[PDB]
Design a protein around this ligand. Structure first.
Ligand SMILES: [Zn+2]
Ligand SMILES: [Zn+2]
Ligand SMILES: [Zn+2]
Lengths: 69, 12
C-alpha cells in the first residue's frame, strides 16, 4: 500500500482524511501530524495538543493497534 | 518513522 492516495489527490481546497486528520480532517498545526508508518492513521496529538507534544518519528513508530498484533 | 507533515491544504 503506497502512501499515494488512489482515492484522494490531496487538493488544497479539500482536505483528505488519509493525508490529514481522520478524526476531524481539518487544518490544525499540520506540521505536527503524527502517523504510524505501518498504517496511514494519525493521532489528534496536534488537534488536542496533549502533554505528549513529542514526535516519535526519530525512529520507526507503530500505532497502539499495530502492537496489538 | 512516517511523520508526514502534510502540506497546508484547506478550502481557503
Ligand atoms: Zn489522501
Ligand atoms: Zn483532528
Ligand atoms: Zn500501525
Amino acid at each position: 500500500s503506497g502512501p499515494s492516495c488512489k482515492h484522494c489527490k490531496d487538493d488544497v481546497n479539500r482536505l483528505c482524511r488519509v493525508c490529514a486528520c481522520h478524526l476531524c480532517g481539518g487544518r490544525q498545526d499540520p506540521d505536527k501530524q503524527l502517523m504510524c508508518d505501518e498504517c496511514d492513521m494519525a493521532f489528534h496529538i496536534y488537534c488536542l495538543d496533549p502533554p505528549l507534544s513529542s514526535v516519535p518519528s526519530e525512529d520507526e513508530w507503530y500505532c497502539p493497534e499495530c502492537r496489538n498484533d | 518513522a512516517r511523520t508526514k507533515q502534510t502540506a497546508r491544504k484547506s478550502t481557503g
